[PDB]
Design a protein around this ligand. Structure first.
Ligand SMILES: [Mg+2]
Ligand SMILES: [Mg+2]
Ligand SMILES: [Mg+2]
Ligand SMILES: [Mg+2]
Ligand SMILES: [Mg+2]
Ligand SMILES: [Mg+2]
Ligand SMILES: [Mg+2]
Ligand SMILES: [Mg+2]
Ligand SMILES: [Mg+2]
Ligand SMILES: [Mg+2]
Ligand SMILES: [Zn+2]
Lengths: 100, 131, 107, 106, 50, 62
RNA sequence: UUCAAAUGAGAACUUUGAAGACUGAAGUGGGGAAAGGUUCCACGUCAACAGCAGUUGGACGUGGGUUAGUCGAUCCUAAGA
RNA sequence: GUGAACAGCCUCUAGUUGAUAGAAUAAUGUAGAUAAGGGAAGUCGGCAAAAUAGAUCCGUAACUUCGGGAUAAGGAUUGGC
């Protein structure tokens, strides 16, 4: 187990070329947390309670915007040169219709 | 194989061997003969100032003194302490002439050893006095 | 057929005599060829952690033997030309010596 | 000179979640705090106590919060909690153990 | 140069305003024989020579 | 997608080089929406963009 | 130089992440003088050009951007005109 | 950092990873090395390579415009603790 941990640490670490990312800035997943705690042999009841509370707090409720524009797109003609509403188009301002 | 080892240990650039130097140091007469050499023009320092252990001539007495005050000479002296590794050592290591090798080692321990040590001490004090 | 096995690959005899700037890329290509030989799949995908294991000691410092976990799985996309593909993962062990081909039970 | 300095550590969140042992942590600190270059030399110098939520270290001989954090991180690595639990400071000489940011699985 | 004279900057401004392709409505005119801008200039093709 | 501008803006806002800026590879659309330094600051605050630590040059052997 | 994902009809060459390397402060870094004149930046975008490729570009199309009593010119004189 | 040192070599900050690619390893080349014994017998010609090289100590001729020649020549040493 000690030799295996040495090999895993060697494959993980690359300290000569760059630094390791900070854990205080990174975030990880509850599935990995649960499986690591299960490997360590702890009790996951409290952690599962916290995760269930977080999942029940994180709910998605539809609104009028989701009902009306959920699958729609555009609603405005895209310009040929990618210009704004009041931006002059040197090439195309003198031709009103798209056929011409 | 490499250039350094080739140009140092080429056959034509060979040096005197440890067993021969040990045999030279063993007897007082040989030490006296190597200390009192005829003046040879083909040797540095007219054949004088000759370190027997390193088998090396020096051009000057100060050169000999600086050589004695050096780690190379100390390394040679440390090498010349024990058995000089003749063919009998390898033969007995293989399992051949074991009694002959044991008798040789016993003779070295009893007779050759202390006399060679005393000759080395006399040579050391003579070099210290003359230098 | 979905399957998963563990192998030891001898990269030493596959990289014997290779120019130093090509050793790790040739190790990548040889591992792909190894997976194609053992699974019959033209589509072989290497894990980035496996790429790290290959490149750990620079461009010319590939290990003599590597312990690999090869999984033949199903290609779910319709636009893909092949129904199956191989996915190669590193098996970080104490040593890659004295190990035989084994089958991993998928749960 | 030798003014007593007190450092407090709050292990309440990992202890309540049940992946931490305050008594084991206090015993590790007792065994591994060095004085004048040697372990087990805490004679009337460093006192470590715990009550299930707070671990208190009162020292009069060359102890710092950086050293306490170093020893706590060594203990966390030994118990394989280095990737999940970190040592944070709330105010001067008062610290806590906090879990890293975890998103719910959903 | 960054520190330039007003005469140089004015000539640069005129060149910038001249740098354009044809308007599309020119091509639609009756008996139009102009099909491209034959005097177009780019900064890496023909130097203005002050 | 093309996040070259967002990487440059993140480097300028954080105050380090482009070599020290980490963009979350999962929030690609969220980064592509950020066309302003204010939006880049929001991304840095919520953790989509992270500043890496410096590569160590230890002096222990010295 | 390599791996994965994204984009895309199409990826050896685009983007992000993961790796291996290099310039090694007399730099492949950060600014300027002469010169160039918009090449700067954003959006759109691939017919021609980038002696392979290209979804990329100092390319093509449409625009945005250079704020001074104290920084310069402007003033002084030099060899000279 | 090593080192007398803006030398060479390695690293931090910053910046690049650009130059058509893939597969094999015949001859002949371009660039770089090694070689038993002999040691210029080669060639118009020691062309080219090899040998020497830092620092410390001993010591250093003819000649001379007395300032030099001179690092002349010729010898010994170098690590770690
Ligand atoms: Mg070969
Ligand atoms: Mg170099
Ligand atoms: Mg380097
Ligand atoms: Mg082309
Ligand atoms: Mg640009
Ligand atoms: Mg343009
Ligand atoms: Mg030879
Ligand atoms: Mg001849
Ligand atoms: Mg001849
Ligand atoms: Mg001379
Ligand atoms: Zn000697």
């Amino acid at each position: 187990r000690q030799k295996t941990m040495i090999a895993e640490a060697r494959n993980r670490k690359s300290l000569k070329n760059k630094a390791i990312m900070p854990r205080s800035k990174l975030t990880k997943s509850f599935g990995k947390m649960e499986e690591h705690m299960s490997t360590l042999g702890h009790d996951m009841s409290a952690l599962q309670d916290k995760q269930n509370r977080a999942a029940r707090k994180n709910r998605y409720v539809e609104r009028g915007s989701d009902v009306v524009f959920g699958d729609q797109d555009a609603l405005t003609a895209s310009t040929e040169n990618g210009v704004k509403l009041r931006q002059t188009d040197r090439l195309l301002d003198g031709v009103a219709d798209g056929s011409m | 194989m490499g250039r350094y080892s080739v140009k140092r240990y080429k056959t034509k650039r060979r040096t005197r061997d440890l067993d021969l130097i040990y045999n030279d140091l063993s007897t007082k007469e040989s030490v006296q003969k190597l200390l009192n050499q005829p003046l040879d023009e083909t040797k540095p320092g007219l054949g004088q100032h000759y370190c027997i252990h390193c088998a090396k001539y020096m051009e000057t007495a100060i050169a000999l003194k600086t050589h004695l005050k050096g780690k190379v000479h100390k390394r040679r002296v440390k090498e010349l302490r024990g058995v000089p590794y003749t063919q009998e050592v390898s033969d007995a290591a293989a399992g051949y002439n074991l009694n002959k090798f044991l008798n040789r080692v016993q003779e070295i321990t009893q007779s050759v050893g202390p006399e060679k040590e005393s000759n080395e001490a006399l040579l050391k004090e003579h070099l210290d006095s003359t230098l | 057929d979905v399957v998963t096995r563990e192998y030891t690959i001898n990269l030493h005899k596959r990289l014997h005599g290779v120019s130093f700037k090509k050793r790790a890329p040739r190790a990548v290509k040889e591992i792909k060829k190894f997976a194609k030989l053992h699974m019959g799949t033209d589509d072989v995908r290497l894990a980035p952690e496996l790429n790290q294991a290959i490149w750990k000691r620079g461009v010319k410092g590939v290990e003599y033997r590597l312990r690999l976990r090869i999984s033949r799985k199903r290609n779910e996309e319709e636009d893909a030309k092949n129904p199956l593909f191989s996915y190669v993962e590193p098996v970080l062990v104490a040593s890659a010596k004295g190990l035989q081909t084994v089958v991993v039970e998928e749960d | 000179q030798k003014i007593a300095k007190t450092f407090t550590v709050d292990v309440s969140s990992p202890t309540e979640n049940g992946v931490f042992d305050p008594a084991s942590y206090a015993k590790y600190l007792i065994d591994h705090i060095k004085v004048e270059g040697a372990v087990g030399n805490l004679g009337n110098a460093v006192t470590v106590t715990e009550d299930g939520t707070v671990v208190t270290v009162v020292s009069t001989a060359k102890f710092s919060g950086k050293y306490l954090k170093y020893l706590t991180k060594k203990y966390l690595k030994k118990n394989q909690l280095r990737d999940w639990i970190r040592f944070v400071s709330t105010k001067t000489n008062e610290y806590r153990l906090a879990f890293y940011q975890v998103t719910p699985e959903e | 140069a960054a520190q330039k004279s007003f005469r140089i900057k004015q000539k640069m401004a005129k060149a910038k305003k001249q740098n354009r392709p044809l308007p599309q409505w020119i091509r639609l005119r009756t008996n139009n024989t102009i099909r491209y801008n034959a005097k177009r200039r780019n900064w890496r093709r023909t130097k203005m020579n002050i | 997608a093309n996040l070259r501008t967002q990487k440059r803006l993140a480097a300028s806002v954080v105050g380090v080089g482009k070599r020290k800026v980490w963009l979350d590879p999962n929030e690609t659309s969220e980064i592509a929406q950020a066309n302003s330094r204010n939006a880049i600051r929001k991304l840095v605050k919520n953790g989509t963009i992270v500043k890496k630590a410096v590569t160590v040059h230890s002096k222990s052997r010295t």
